[PDB]
Design a protein around this ligand. Structure first.
Ligand SMILES: *[C@@H]1O[C@H](CO)[C@@H](O[C@@H]2O[C@H](CO)[C@@H](O[C@@H]3O[C@H](CO[C@H]4O[C@H](CO)[C@@H](O)[C@H](O)[C@@H]4O)[C@@H](O)[C@H](O[C@H]4O[C@H](CO)[C@@H](O)[C@H](O)[C@@H]4O)[C@@H]3O)[C@H](O)[C@H]2NC(C)=O)[C@H](O)[C@H]1NC(C)=O
Ligand SMILES: *[C@@H]1O[C@H](CO)[C@@H](O[C@@H]2O[C@H](CO)[C@@H](O[C@@H]3O[C@H](CO[C@H]4O[C@H](CO)[C@@H](O)[C@H](O)[C@@H]4O)[C@@H](O)[C@H](O[C@H]4O[C@H](CO)[C@@H](O)[C@H](O)[C@@H]4O)[C@@H]3O)[C@H](O)[C@H]2NC(C)=O)[C@H](O)[C@H]1NC(C)=O
Ligand code: DO5
Ligand code: DO5
Ligand code: BOG
Ligand code: BOG
Ligand code: BOG
Ligand code: BOG
Ligand code: BOG
Ligand code: BOG
Ligand code: BOG
Ligand code: BOG
Ligand code: BOG
Ligand code: BOG
Ligand code: PLM
Ligand code: PLM
Lengths: 326, 326
């Protein structure tokens, strides 16, 4: 008897006291104090104030500067759009519902907010996977006679959408489902209930393999071979100080990006391992939602790492922000 | 009968309904809805998350990099400390009281939070005034045989403290007073009550002249002469492209800083002019507090303009953040 159970939701709180209400009808102030909902709102406000400008500005400086519109940068524009999906589909909606103490948009806004918030995070995840593959192909040159072109970059973007739809769409059709999560103010895939009517268990395994394990392997393989290829070539030209500097900075950026991915990826693995073991105990609204809580920050630091730390993007943004000067 | 009146406070709400309570005892939810207090909390959280790192990091990179510890930069360290006073003395306290709906620290925490929050904003104001004077003396060279030294920079910092104490201390001694302001969650100088026991009217005139008009004149005079002196000298060396570039960027930075000062300064003048005229009508909790609401942002954008846009500070912060590399 961990929580209270009903049609289209699961409240992580026992109803032996009789105080539990529908997360669509009444505020869930037994899960957390009202000020904790306000701090959830403050967190959403922080993410919106930092997440929209950075991501929208990536799309804006690309319009003003011709040198940014290269095929290898298409996946970064896709990343910026994905974060805006997280910012408006997820963070903005949650800020509004948080101040009500419950998900005021009903069971259908759950499918809406859940889909778009899940889609944005999925598109961002695979955009990092695709960017890893694209850079691997360009540097390591695995294909004998291959040139990365505009059509190849469009496929990579379309591939993220297919993979993101592969995760976000089944819950609408009958494989898993969208229910309020955590403090019941935002919606997402139901990892919290073994709902046999929608075969939730099979969907969690599918998510764990296809959308969790595979992205880590692909990212680790591609960037590993890239750093190996770069260090191998620089070893053949140790007379060039620039090549040695270029090798150092490429390695350092790969380390930064891989550490960044792990910071978002490990909390899910740690919590899941703590649920694989310690399986018996009940779970408050912060058991599996703690990884998701901090993963929202990726909408801010991912553009900082991949776009703001890009050399050309930075100069173009400085020029754009400064009315064209400096 | 604009608001309700009592010992040590003035609530901007009529008590004909009988619902008004002491801003020290009970929440002021007739001034604003609970979610509006939460948004006040979210605003404080945004200012804290942006204001503490930027300002503390100014103090931190100065410790790691010897070239930053120049006398002309002392007033910028004073500015960073001033903003931390605003961040901890003001923003942090307000975030806590906001979630209670009233000033839970009583009439004495009013004198405490009011003093330190007023002191931080005053130190920052005069630090910009002193930096304007210091740069004017160094560039325009008004004194015939003068060299700006370490002792001269220490006087400039001490001068800001004397001026800031000249404003923040009288309310504790009997000239004006500290009362809850706006939504009664933060404390400050009483511009809202003609309290004849503390001669509030004379203090407002004193603040308007010494701490509002004079800082604008000094800043406008110093930077005007500086831009004039720089453009005059560059006109004598139009063969030097760097001098012309240096003149352009100095002028552009002065414009940025003066526009920034006006953005913080004009709303006070606009509201005061709208109170000088239209004197009869009553005022909600957002009449004179709207300038103060947006002036809190100076704790974030002032370090961005004066420190983050400094050439040496930027490279030192990048090196410090990047564990010493790049
Ligand atoms: C967590 O657990 C709590 C407690 O069990 C659940 O809350 C209860 O939900 C039931 C509905 O299933 C509520 O029962 C309904 O109450 C209505 C109002 O009752 C009050 O008002 C009447 C006056 O109209 C008073 O006389 C009465 O004493 C109550 O104070 C009634 O109108 C309903 O009556 C109808 O349904 C019943 C069958 O349930 C029929 O017998 C009637 O003839 C009539 O058709 C009904 O009694 C109950 O009041 C709720 N209790 C509390 C404390 O809120 C939550 O639903 C549960 N949470 C989740 C998520 O499931
Ligand atoms: C805005 O305006 C409101 C309304 O005028 C003010 O709120 C009132 O404040 C007064 C205090 O000045 C309150 O009066 C006191 O109420 C106490 C509680 O009364 C209730 O409970 C008793 C049972 O104990 C009931 O019988 C009664 O009907 C009430 O429902 C009393 O204990 C107090 O009595 C003492 O003082 C009076 C003199 O004031 C003596 O005659 C008594 O013998 C005894 O010594 C007193 O009556 C009043 O209740 C408040 N009203 C409301 C609605 O809150 C706010 O103070 C004002 N705001 C500001 C900032 O000034
Ligand atoms: C993009 C988003 O949609 C995706 C997700 O939210 N996921 C739910 C939790 C997840 C991973 C998938 O973690 C699990 C642990 C054990 C079993 C199933 C699990 O699914 C995700 C993928 C990678 C990262 Cl770095 C962060 C989030
Ligand atoms: C540092 C802070 O302490 C100072 C202040 O808060 N002030 C209260 C309002 C103030 C100015 C002084 O505006 C008035 C208008 C009419 C009469 C009296 C007035 O006082 C301040 C000075 C300059 C600026 Cl840019 C912003 C704030
Ligand atoms: C680093 C600073 C951490 C501060 C944590 C503050 C946690 C406050 O916690 C709150 O305290 C109130 C009493 O003060 C209680 O009434 C509330 O129920 C409780 O949630
Ligand atoms: C910019 C963000 C705006 C958010 C508006 C939040 C409005 C909350 O609305 C409040 O919800 C409560 C239930 O929790 C009700 O009891 C209150 O009557 C209602 O005012
Ligand atoms: C480094 C990889 C970046 C991908 C970040 C995606 C984070 C998405 O986080 C996800 O958000 C969904 C909707 O809010 C929730 O349903 C999921 O529980 C949560 O894991
Ligand atoms: C998929 C993630 C792969 C990350 C590969 C990081 C490999 C780091 O490798 C290290 O890089 C340093 C760079 O100066 C060198 O000094 C070290 O000798 C080298 O071992
Ligand atoms: C010590 C601080 C720990 C903070 C962890 C809080 C985790 C709360 O859980 C959160 O509940 C919200 C309700 O809608 C969801 O939107 C978030 O995705 C979820 O992470
Ligand atoms: C740009 C978007 C602006 C959104 C402003 C939302 C203002 C909401 O305002 C709130 O609406 C609620 C009903 O929805 C009422 O119950 C509350 O009393 C009211 O404060
Ligand atoms: C990190 C910020 C922590 C802020 C903690 C806020 C605690 C608010 O505490 C709440 O105040 C209400 C009065 O407004 C009381 O009615 C509630 O009983 C009390 O829980
Ligand atoms: C460009 C000049 C920067 C100075 C910014 C200082 C802003 C201070 O703002 C002041 O804060 C006080 C305490 O919060 C309040 O009492 C005052 O009403 C308010 O004007
Ligand atoms: C105290 C505030 C003084 C601000 C002085 C700003 C003077 C701007 O002056 C302008 O600067 C431009 C720079 O390229 C020149 O092109 C213009 O000819 C010149 O008039
Ligand atoms: C359209 C949005 C306008 C927002 C203006 C809100 C002004 C509220 O007024 C604010 O009240 C607070 C109560 O402690 C004080 O801390 C702030 O200094 C004061 O500016
Ligand atoms: C040139 O590239 C710079 C042009 C001038 C921009 C300076 C102002 C930037 C302000 C950014 C900080 C805003 C703080 C808001 C905090 C809520
Ligand atoms: C070198 O100068 C950079 C070193 C690596 C730093 C990259 C990570 C920076 C993260 C900043 C963004 C944090 C976002 C948090 C949002 C709440």
């Amino acid at each position: 008897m961990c929580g209270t159970e009903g049609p289209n939701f699961y409240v992580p709180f026992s109803n032996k006291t009789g105080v539990v209400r529908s997360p669509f009808e009444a505020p869930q102030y037994y899960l957390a104090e009202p000020w904790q909902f306000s701090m959830l709102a403050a967190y959403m406000f922080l993410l919106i104030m930092l997440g929209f400008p950075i991501n929208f500005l990536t799309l804006y400086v690309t319009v003003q500067h011709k040198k940014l519109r290269t095929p290898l940068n298409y996946i970064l524009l896709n990343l910026a759009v994905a974060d805006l999906f997280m910012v408006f589909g997820g963070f903005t909606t949650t800020l509004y519902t948080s101040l009500h103490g419950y998900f005021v948009f009903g069971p259908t806004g759950c499918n809406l907010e859940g889909f778009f918030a899940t889609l944005g995070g999925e598109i961002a995840l695979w955009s990092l996977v695709v960017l890893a593959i694209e850079r691997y192909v360009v540097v390591c040159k695995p294909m004998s006679n291959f040139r990365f072109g505009e059509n190849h970059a469009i496929m990579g973007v379309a591939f993220t959408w297919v993979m993101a739809l592969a995760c976000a769409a089944p819950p609408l059709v009958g494989w898993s489902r969208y229910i309020p999560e955590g403090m019941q103010c935002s919606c997402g895939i139901d990892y919290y209930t073994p709902h046999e009517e929608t075969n939730n268990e099979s969907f969690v395994i599918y998510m764990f393999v296809v959308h969790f394990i595979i992205p880590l392997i692909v990212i680790f393989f591609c960037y590993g071979q890239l750093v190996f290829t770069v260090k191998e070539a620089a070893a053949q030209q140790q007379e060039s100080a620039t090549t040695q500097k270029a090798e150092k900075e490429v390695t350092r950026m790969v380390i930064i990006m891989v550490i960044a991915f792990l910071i978002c990826w490990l909390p899910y693995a740690g919590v899941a391992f703590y649920i694989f073991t310690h399986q018996g105990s009940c779970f408050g609204p912060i058991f599996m939602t703690i990884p998701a809580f901090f993963a929202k920050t990726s909408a801010v630091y991912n553009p900082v790492i991949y776009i703001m730390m890009n050399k050309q993007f930075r100069n173009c943004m400085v020029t754009t922000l400064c009315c064209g000067k400096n």
